[PDB]
């Protein structure tokens, strides 16, 4: 199902990492490495399938691991109101 980064989130990249600020909850977060890469792909409007394929192309990792980890990561983003439209 269609999803996107919350319109309330500001992203601040700092070499390798991203700091996220949620303007309505007033909470901030950090991402690094693969999390930061996933965030960048979400910023581009990439769908979960596309994100899985990108991580599989860019990292020494098997598809099942990427799928399992991505699901949990997207759920964590959704739980903190950083990502909208998420469904399993």
């Amino acid at each position: 199902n269609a999803m996107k980064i919350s319109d309330a989130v500001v992203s601040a990249h700092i070499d390798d990492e991203v700091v996220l600020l949620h303007l309505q909850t007033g909470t901030y977060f950090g991402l690094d490495a693969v999390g930061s890469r996933i965030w960048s792909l979400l910023e581009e409007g990439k769908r979960p399938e596309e994100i899985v394929d990108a991580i599989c192309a860019e990292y020494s990792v098997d598809r099942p691991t990427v799928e399992r980890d991505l699901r949990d990561f997207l759920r964590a983003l959704a739980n903190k109101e950083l990502l909208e439209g998420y469904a399993d």
């Binding site: 490495a33 693969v34 996933i38 860019e58 990292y59 020494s60 990561f73 903190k80």
Partner: peptide
């Protein structure tokens, strides 16, 4: 190609505004 580690969301808490 890069070494993989599981993506994690780090929470820092309340920002200074």
């Amino acid at each position: 190609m890069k070494e993989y580690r599981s993506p994690e969301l780090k929470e820092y808490g309340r920002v200074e505004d």
